[PDB]
Amino acid sequence: IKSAIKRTKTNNERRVHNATIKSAMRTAIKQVEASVANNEADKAKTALTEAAKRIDKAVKTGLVHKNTAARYKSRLAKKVNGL
Amino acid sequence: SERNQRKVYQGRVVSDKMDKTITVVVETYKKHTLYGKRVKYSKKFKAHDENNQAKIGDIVKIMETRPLSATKRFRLVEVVEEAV
Amino acid sequence: AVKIRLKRMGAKKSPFYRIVVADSRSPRDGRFIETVGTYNPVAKPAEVKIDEELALKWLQTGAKPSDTVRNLFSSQGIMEKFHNAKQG
RNA sequence: AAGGAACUCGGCAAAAUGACCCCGUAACUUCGGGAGAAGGGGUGCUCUGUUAGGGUGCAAGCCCGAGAGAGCCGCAGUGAAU
């Protein structure tokens, strides 16, 4: 009613776009965990570079917030360097 | 610049039975709003024993801290007097 | 954010303004951080009272006054002191 | 089929429950009971597992098989019987 219809519209746009970025971030971190449970070194390292890339870009755009980004990066780093 | 000092108590151990912790009766005691006489109250706190070096009936100091779990906000400082 | 702004006090037909360091968020007569002195408009002459050093203290942490509070600072002369400090 | 005790002297007869495990359980009470009250849930097969855990054995290997996860089929897994 009170011309928040543009905020509803762009809210749905940013919802869809941010969910793409979040899901790519999730699949990258999950790819790291899959290449740690399988005991690979080189693919795990290139997956960690990919995952930290996804995490820092998701922080650059929006709402992942370097504290929780640091949580994800730190656990993925400890689990690749635990090999 | 020495940082701000946390709250400290001394007390008496009620129980040892929880894993790596105790509870502590602080017996600080105070007067009324109306009749003025000074009456006593016992406050038992949940406190962390990381070495579990405690016994029931032990005079002990505790430091306050960040919340260590549900109901825990305290840890040991100096186990002063042991039970007999 | 932090703004030195007038704050309404007084009767109905006779206003009065305490020059008051508040946020833009907070209500006009509501909560506020600290105050410097006063402002009588309804005197037929002048009569502003500004603390002139604690106001200066709030200007430098970053607190931009409203237009009438700014020109009251100019009338007592604290914006010139602030410009001398920035030229320092 | 639909209805469901309208049958009837009267739910007579028939139908329905009907195993094992877990949960939960009233009035009253002579304190024991009531009580299997009631009312619910899960029960197949497969792989994790010759398992967790026990019995025998000196060990091998034989029995007994709670619990969980994953999954697979069916309208239906105490798939019949009682």
Add this chain to the structure above:
RNA sequence: GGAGAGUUUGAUCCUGGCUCAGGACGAACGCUGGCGGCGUGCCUAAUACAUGCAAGUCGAGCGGACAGAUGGGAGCUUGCUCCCUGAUGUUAGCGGCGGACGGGUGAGUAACACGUGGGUAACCUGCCUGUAAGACUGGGAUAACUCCGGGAAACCGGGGCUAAUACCGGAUGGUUGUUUGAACCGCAUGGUUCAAACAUAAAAGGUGGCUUCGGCUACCACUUACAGAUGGACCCGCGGCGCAUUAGCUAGUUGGUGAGGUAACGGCUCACCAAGGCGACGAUGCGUAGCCGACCUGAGAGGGUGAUCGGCCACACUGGGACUGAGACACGGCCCAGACUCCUACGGGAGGCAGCAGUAGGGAAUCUUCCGCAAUGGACGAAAGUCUGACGGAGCAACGCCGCGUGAGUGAUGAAGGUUUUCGGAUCGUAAAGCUCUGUUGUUAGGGAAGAACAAGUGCCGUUCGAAUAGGGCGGUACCUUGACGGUACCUAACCAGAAAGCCACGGCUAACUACGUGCCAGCAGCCGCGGUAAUACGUAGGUGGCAAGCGUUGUCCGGAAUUAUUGGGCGUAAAGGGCUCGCAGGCGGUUUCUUAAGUCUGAUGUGAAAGCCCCCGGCUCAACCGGGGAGGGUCAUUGGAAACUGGG
């Protein structure tokens, strides 16, 4: 700074309750009613809402549009009609920022909700500052616009096209993570700073002016880090409630290890173990309740309240959820389910006044469907400006407080008339009329403030940038502007006592008395109690008394009430000693001395916001009220002295 009185009796003294005299309301009711100032005005149904507004803005981010005509031509009827891109204005859409503030309500909520004091080495923070580094190189879509198609609408889908300060790659980065060295410091987890490498993580341009056309610069904006500031988070001590005719309550409950999750610590969430946790110092349960600054009463201690104003909280038709965004799980956003209202072409849609006005209902009961953004805030903008039911005002109500009124000086014929009378008079009583006179107010008519400071626009001057006197920022002047209230408060002149007083009581408490009617009837009453033919108690008249645009009644608080007694009461016989013991917890503890410092006292520091009570001055014609300045209030935290007493050894 502290008042009592009636009532148990034939009479009395105690005990003892009851009743009264006071002050207050967001009060209502009844009678009555003049103005001005300032405040307040759904306490009830957190009942339901017709309508109107209550959140938009930026063309200096962007693409397309609509107009418009500086010049340029066009065709003729002298009536007219285009097409090039001038300035110039208008803004569906993208986009950014705001919508999370401001305004309402008190339903929930008995615990970190709040107050007060802390802790965070366990945290987040857009816009704002200040400083430091930067800002390169490309890419692909999309709204609008069209062209279809589907819909009753709400609107939706398909193909085309297009830009950004939109989005996405990419480079460079002192963030963040990892790994290795150091250095110093704590309160257990740990903290701060230095270095190296590895992995990534940026960014955007727009306006003006200068120009050799490469660029260069200011302003705004963009990115990263570090501070400040501000807002937010979580955690702990203390504190503020009724019931025990609520005694047992828990099981993610109580801990552990590990993981996830969070801005962060955490059973916050999950696996696996352990049997814990709260408890008569009142757990749990039930009932009630927003908390506070404050407000009313009181000598005070207290008791009651939680309206306005201000802080924090929680809520948004009911329950749940997330989205986006720095910050929401969002009053005027979204998705879902329920009830209700509405529309429907029956397929499906829309809605949420506990925002300002107003309506209906409930009720003893509380207002205008108003003017303005002039002032103070907000949002956006570079600004002009726009939006703003916040806010300024205005209207209604004696709803409260306060101030001025309805006349004044003189006046004995004590006039008329009332009421009473032992009929001598007394009284209404100098009160009317007589004389004299004012105009606050009433009215008419003129004059007319403070509330305005500004913003922006010019000109200067100093100064920082600059390749530069461009040009812009910053500061000081020096002008031109801006009022809804409103020709309102206010001042000045003219006129007439002319327009302006009521309510309650009169036995005592309790100030104030007679007469006539009534006859235990009508009725009064707060109590003692009146009234049954001589009623100062009923009804009326006169009078008096109290107050006064108020007065009286009611409803609740508090006092009186020493009637919950801490201040400040009691128990032989008035109410009250358990039938008595043994004793757990609790309370209390003879003496001398040393020591400690929890209690106690004292100092310093911070703090208990603003308003309020109080003191001192100031301004409204005084007052209410406003304003300034101070004080006060903590069993509060840290810190320092004392050691008599209580406690500790």
Add this chain to the structure above:
RNA sequence: CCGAAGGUGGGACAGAUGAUUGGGGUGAAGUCGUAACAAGGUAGCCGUAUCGGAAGGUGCGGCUGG
């Protein structure tokens, strides 16, 4: 997976209402006695049992508030 609502079920608390009932209070000079107050005409009362239209009586123990 969680999950609001809804559904089924058995309990818990709380308010109404209910034929009938039991005690209580107050009321126009109602009926029966007269239990208490005096040595109240059987001293009274307390506890307890029992009986009786009813106050009450009687037993036992206690008390003077004979």
